[PDB]
Amino acid sequence: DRVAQLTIGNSTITTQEAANIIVGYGEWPSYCSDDDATAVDKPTRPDVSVNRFYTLDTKLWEKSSKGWYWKFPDVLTETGVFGQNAQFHYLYRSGFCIHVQCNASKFHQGALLVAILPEYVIGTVAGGTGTEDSHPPYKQTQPGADGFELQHPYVLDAGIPISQLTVCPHQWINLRTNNCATIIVPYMNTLPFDSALNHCNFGLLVVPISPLDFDQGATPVIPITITLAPMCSEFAGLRQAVTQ
């Protein structure tokens, strides 16, 4: 139960210090029913070429880090064959298998909260005073694969408490216990299909709740890598490639 292997497509992930697997809302990704669908054109289900593990950028965990987030359909729109299909097709649909990995040693300590927040809408500080109706820039609402850093993690940059973020599919990475978190997310939206460009079904939040710490001499560079794989990907409404 502490060891596990995730194989999908032509990619395999290994781990010897896992903490089980979470299946968001107790549901596995699935394809769209014939009665839940509307688009009449036959969709493309590329399978193995898009349903595989993509490893996005690595972040560095510092004793003062606040946390980061990634919007999901988004992080992959410019990567591999998944990205190509997401650009050529109007409609997209899929679940995800997210595997956040971060290892240290038996002498390091700290705890990361890895959670999935559906429809993660970002807010602004409203000019500090709260009298200015400002809005988050494109660079912040859809940060891409590089993710974005939280400025006010306590309120998740959206006026909501992070202490309650656990009502969402989550898992923790407690260095003294495990070195990775695995969460499987089904397609969640009020529509059977939607644009992979304009809409971000959910956001991945990785936030340090218990600060990283260690004594001088132990390796100081502790990376946090994000690996994710689409599941049951379906695309429809073919046309030319659109970036945004």
Partner: protein
């Protein structure tokens, strides 16, 4: 001990204020005997905070319209309420041709009659209403000037509610119409953290950055009550 009072229907099936329309005699706010209220239950904190506990919600509703003067006085006046779905012609005056309601649903009541009450179905083109929409309604470049549209979902924009004095002359009294909503047959999905800060605007979750208060009460020391 029963768990019945914590079902979604028990929780949400209670009428609460969601709208308030003024029809004064003299002023700069609807002084021509008619008004167009954009249907949005996000204008009042109590009702808004409850529904924002969930991300998506599907439900039928019961709207009640309580009308009277600004002093609470009941006056012998005849009003006309009209539901104008998006796309229908919104009345531009008290004598607008749109008041013919050949197809739109209208209600004619006197302020002396008990508050008008009516049943409304789930009329969204989506499978549920979204109190939160993390995205834009249209494609294209999203410049500073158009950030006004972020978080605006048309699937929640049900239209307009119009009111007027059924006449061709100025009313003899100043009026106010309070709109109450009671949800029925409720389905709800994906719970979220409950509003932490004061509300400032309708179409968004903006908060006063200089007055970010703690979720609750505070104390002197952690080792003393």
């Amino acid at each position: 001990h029963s768990t019945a009072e914590t079902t979604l229907d028990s929780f949400f099936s209670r009428a609460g204020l969601v709208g308030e329309i003024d029809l004064p005699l003299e002023g700069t706010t609807n002084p021509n005997g008619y008004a167009n209220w954009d249907i949005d239950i996000t204008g009042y904190a109590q009702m808004r905070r409850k529904v924002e506990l969930f991300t998506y919600m599907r439900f039928d509703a019961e709207f009640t319209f309580v009308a009277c003067t600004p002093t609470g006085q009941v006056v012998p006046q005849l009003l006309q309420y009209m539901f104008v779905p998006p796309g229908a012609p919104k009345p531009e005056s008290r004598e607008s041709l749109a008041w013919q309601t050949a197809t739109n649903p209208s209600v004619f009541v006197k302020l002396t009659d008990p508050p008008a009450q009516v049943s409304v179905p789930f009329m969204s083109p989506a499978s549920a209403y979204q109190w939160f929409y993390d995205g834009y309604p249209t494609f294209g470049e999203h410049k500073q000037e158009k950030d006004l549209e972020y978080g605006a979902c048309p699937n929640n924009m049900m239209g307009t509610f119009s009111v007027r004095n059924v006449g061709s002359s100025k009313s003899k009294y100043p009026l106010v119409v309070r709109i109450y909503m009671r949800m029925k047959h409720v389905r709800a999905w994906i719970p979220r953290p409950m509003r932490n800060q004061n509300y400032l605007f309708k179409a968004n979750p903006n908060y006063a950055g200089n007055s970010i208060k703690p979720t609750g009460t505070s104390r002197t020391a952690i080792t003393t009550l």
